[PDB]
Design a protein around this ligand. Structure first.
Ligand SMILES: *[C@@H]1O[C@H](CO[C@@H]2O[C@@H](C)[C@@H](O)[C@@H](O)[C@@H]2O)[C@@H](O)[C@H](O)[C@H]1NC(C)=O
Ligand SMILES: *[C@@H]1[C@H](O)[C@@H](O)[C@H](O[C@@H]2C[C@@H](O)[C@H](O)[C@@H](CO)O2)[C@@H](C(=O)O)[C@H]1O
Ligand SMILES: *[C@@H]1O[C@H](CO)[C@@H](O)[C@H](O)[C@H]1NC(C)=O
Ligand SMILES: *[C@@H]1O[C@H](CO)[C@@H](O)[C@H](O)[C@H]1NC(C)=O
Ligand SMILES: *[C@@H]1O[C@H](CO)[C@@H](O)[C@H](O)[C@H]1NC(C)=O
Ligand SMILES: *[C@@H]1O[C@H](CO)[C@@H](O)[C@H](O)[C@H]1NC(C)=O
Ligand SMILES: [Cl-]
Ligand SMILES: [Cl-]
Lengths: 74, 384
């Protein structure tokens, strides 16, 4: 027998997730790629990104703790 | 690991990518900048906060990534108490900024091993008052050693439940009711499992993780990564979507914020994994009270699911995902109801086309597959 009965609890919501429940990261390491500007400038990638809105985008990773902001750099 | 600098330019690329994509940016600050007496040195963060203010950038903040492994990474040990004080200091900086209401998340600890649970507990005692959400991380496998069988093993999927229970035990003991987020998560660490983390086979772990996260009280799940070098990326090096991107998009179109519960009447209750939410009300095909069921079949045969009273005779839309051949579960291409999912062009996502079933038919779920089912006119009061 490959038939399976489901039981549903539908009385009340057991939890409420954020509308952004399914969110994404960009690893901090990607900012050390010389092509950072070209990659994130890609119209094709922005279309895919828009598809997942609403979402958080976390810019973070091991490299979070080895990145220093330098306002002089170009 | 070496110190690297980044420019105002890099900050603008990142902010613009998020802003123009409708995403909310969370920026992790460097927690290893330390004073003589091993307090956090906030002076570099200060320069970034100033610059972001001056550009009107609406940005959320984190401080540090996996502080539990700082000793391993940088031969510096910061305890949870100190890290809490460091977060208190960042909170005071944010309150004095132009975005005084900016959100602060942390501490982005790894999964709750004894030493990580201790760090999280002391961090929440000290710094818990100033964070808007508790972030922690989870991986099922080591990308180097992960096997195809591991990706399909319900005993591997099940370990995530104990991780979640252990995090909530620490949070309920220190800051009851604080929101709990997965701040970094995927199939496998070390950049993913070669030829596995970028395939149809990655989808069992991703959809199970979403299901269980929602069911167990996790409010947000952050997928490592949207795009990047790791083969757990949703989008490859050519900006082409992989099966997990299509799975993620379909989850967003169908699955609502209100979490319910499904279970299988059998005692086995393994390999057949079921989740139930209210349908996403923003979906124009569906209406208040509709349900979205999603199911994973890790059996090597088709299973037939029967909906309970009073949903037995309802019109159901199927959204079944299966790999495009010839590489089976190791495929990087997916079909929805037998239609290959492909961009229309660089600016155009395809429609995601339902397959209506005959009312009162059993829900067919092939071996090694996953599907969404929307139950139309379910008229569930809790969903309205
Ligand atoms: C298939 O998997 C078997 C164990 O699973 C059980 O048997 C199959 C036929 C399904 O009914 C499933 O629901 C059961 O839980 C293995 O022992 C077997 O060698 C595998 N392959 C086959 C039979 O094709
Ligand atoms: C979580 C960390 O915070 C991530 O930075 C880390 O990934 C990064 C980037 C990835 O491309 C690389 O393969 C790995 C390991 O060198 O570091 C995550 C991971 O995949 O291990 C995880 O530790
Ligand atoms: C990074 O910078 C800090 C101070 O700017 C310094 O103390 C530390 O040695 C550097 N870390 C590494 C791993 O080189
Ligand atoms: C923090 O770092 C800056 C520059 O890296 C340094 O000049 C400053 O004296 C440090 N502040 C403290 C309080 O140690
Ligand atoms: C920043 O972003 C979020 C929406 O994602 C919003 O709730 C908040 O009001 C914004 N804050 C400001 C000050 O613009
Ligand atoms: C944590 O570290 C701080 C800073 O080094 C130290 O002063 C404090 O006593 C430590 N806390 C515990 C509980 O050991
Ligand atoms: Cl600690
Ligand atoms: Cl990357």
């Amino acid at each position: 027998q490959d038939v399976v009965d489901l039981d549903f609890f539908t009385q009340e919501p057991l939890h409420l997730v954020s509308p952004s429940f399914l969110s994404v990261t960009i690893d901090a390491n990607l900012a050390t790629d010389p092509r950072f500007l070209i990659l994130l400038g890609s119209p094709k990638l922005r279309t895919l990104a828009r598809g997942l809105s609403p979402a958080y985008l976390r810019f973070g990773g091991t490299k979070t703790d080895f990145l220093i902001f330098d306002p002089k750099k170009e | 690991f070496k110190n690297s600098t980044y420019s105002r330019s890099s900050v603008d690329v990142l902010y613009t990518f998020a802003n123009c994509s409708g995403l909310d940016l969370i920026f992790g600050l460097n927690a290893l900048l330390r004073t003589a007496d091993l307090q956090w040195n906030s002076s570099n963060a200060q320069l970034l906060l100033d610059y972001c203010s001056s550009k009107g950038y609406n940005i959320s903040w984190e401080l540090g990534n996996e502080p539990n492994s700082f000793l391993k990474k940088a031969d510096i040990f910061i305890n949870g108490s100190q890290l809490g004080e460091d977060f208190i200091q960042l909170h005071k900086l944010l309150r004095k900024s132009t975005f005084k209401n900016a959100k602060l998340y942390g501490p982005d600890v790894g999964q709750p091993r004894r030493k990580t649970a201790k760090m999280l507990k002391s961090f929440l005692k000290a710094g818990g008052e100033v964070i808007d959400s508790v972030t922690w991380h989870h991986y099922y496998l080591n990308g180097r050693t992960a096997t195809r069988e591991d990706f399909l093993n319900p005993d591997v999927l099940d370990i995530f439940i104990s991780s979640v229970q252990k995090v909530f035990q620490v949070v309920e003991s220190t800051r009851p009711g604080k929101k709990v987020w997965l701040g970094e998560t995927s199939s496998a660490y070390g950049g993913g499992a070669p030829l596995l983390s970028d395939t149809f086979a990655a989808g069992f772990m991703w959809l199970d993780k979403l299901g269980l996260s929602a069911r167990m009280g996790i409010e947000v799940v952050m997928r490592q990564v949207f795009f990047g070098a790791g083969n757990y990326h949703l989008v490859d090096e050519n900006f082409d979507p992989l099966p997990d991107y299509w799975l993620s998009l379909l989850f967003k179109k169908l699955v609502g914020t209100k979490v319910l519960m499904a279970s299988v009447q059998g005692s086995k209750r393994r390999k057949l994994r079921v989740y139930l939410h209210c349908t996403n009300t923003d979906n124009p095909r569906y209406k208040e009270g509709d349900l979205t069921l999603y199911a994973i079949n890790l059996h090597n045969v088709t299973k037939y699911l029967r909906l309970p009273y009073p949903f037995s005779n309802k019109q159901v839309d199927k959204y079944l995902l299966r790999p495009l051949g010839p590489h089976g579960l190791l495929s990087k291409s997916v079909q929805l109801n037998g239609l290959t999912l492909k961009m229309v062009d660089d600016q155009t996502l395809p429609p995601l086309m339902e397959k209506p079933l005959r009312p009162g038919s059993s829900l067919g779920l092939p071996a090694f597959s996953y599907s969404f089912f929307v139950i139309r006119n379910a008229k569930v009061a809790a969903c309205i």
